[PDB]
Write a protein that binds this ligand. Structure first.
Ligand code: FJF
Length: 272
């Protein structure tokens, strides 16, 4: 009732554009362009609202009008955007996307320096508020310094961390002992551990590596091989019967009181 989840991460305007016919690289080739709310953190925040939790986004948008519409749009979806930064005169984050007639991803551009405005100084302004959430979800779009501040100031509140990409995930390597649940895919787990994840035969040693480095819980998506989960206390298994629904799933199930393995399976069904 007074239980709420806090999400710290980025909010993007996803722009998806594709031509209707073969792309003439000359003049305005008619097509269909879709604007979309995005960012890993903002997406997880929205999914938690849909799941029935009181979700607070801690993010940054620019004063660029389309920033304020991102906030409003996610607000309508349930999220308490009341606390975000509106950054004066910055481009709000966005994730440009160029699809094909087959929805085939051609090129993708990413403008997210505003993500760096989610500072420790900003987060410290809500130290009390953040320290009273039932759980904190952070993505690795924010700076090393900011994520360091979250992990250092969670006041025993569990931090679920979404690694976002192989490039952005590394900022957590030295801080796995502060992360309650980490959700890497194959490449991100390879990148973090330095151990090749060639197939199911290798997850045992990867997970063992994560735990040696203090990770409480690993939820490792192996794509087609399904999901491997591993608790430092010993419980591991496979669920082998999107990632933004997965993270929301895991965090919501935790707050709901659900055991680890049952949460992985549930979140994996929120994913599909
Ligand atoms: O580096 C990043 N790329 C893409 C995203 C966002 O993730 C979403 C897809 O899961 C999408 O909305 C994009 O903006 C991000 O947060 N960081």
């Amino acid at each position: 009732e007074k239980d709420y989840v806090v999400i710290i991460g980025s909010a993007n305007i996803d722009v998806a554009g594709y031509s209707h016919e073969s792309l003439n690289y000359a003049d305005s080739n008619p097509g269909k362009i879709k604007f979309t709310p995005g960012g890993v953190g903002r997406n997880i925040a929205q999914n938690l609202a849909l799941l029935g939790n009181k979700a607070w986004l801690l993010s940054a948008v620019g004063s660029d009008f389309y920033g304020q519409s991102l906030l409003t749009q996610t607000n309508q979806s349930g999220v308490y955007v009341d606390k975000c930064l509106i950054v004066p005169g910055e481009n709000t984050s966005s994730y440009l996307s160029l699809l094909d007639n087959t929805g085939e991803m051609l090129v993708a551009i990413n403008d997210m320096n505003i993500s760096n405005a989610i500072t420790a100084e900003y987060l410290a302004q809500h130290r009390e508020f953040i320290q009273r959430a039932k759980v904190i979800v952070a993505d690795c779009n924010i700076s090393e310094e900011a994520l360091a501040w979250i992990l250092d100031n969670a006041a025993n509140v569990p931090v679920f961390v979404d690694p976002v990409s192989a490039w952005k995930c590394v900022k957590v390597r030295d801080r796995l002992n502060q992360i309650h649940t980490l959700k890497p895919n194959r490449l991100e787990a390879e990148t973090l551990s330095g151990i090749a994840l060639s197939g199911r035969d290798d997850v045992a040693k990867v997970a063992a590596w994560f735990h040696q480095h203090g990770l409480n819980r690993l939820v490792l998506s192996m794509g087609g091989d399904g999901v491997y989960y591993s608790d430092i206390r010993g419980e591991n298994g496979w669920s082998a019967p999107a990632g933004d629904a997965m993270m929301a799933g895991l965090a919501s199930c935790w707050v709901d009181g659900m055991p680890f393995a049952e949460s992985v399976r549930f979140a994996q069904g929120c994913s599909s």
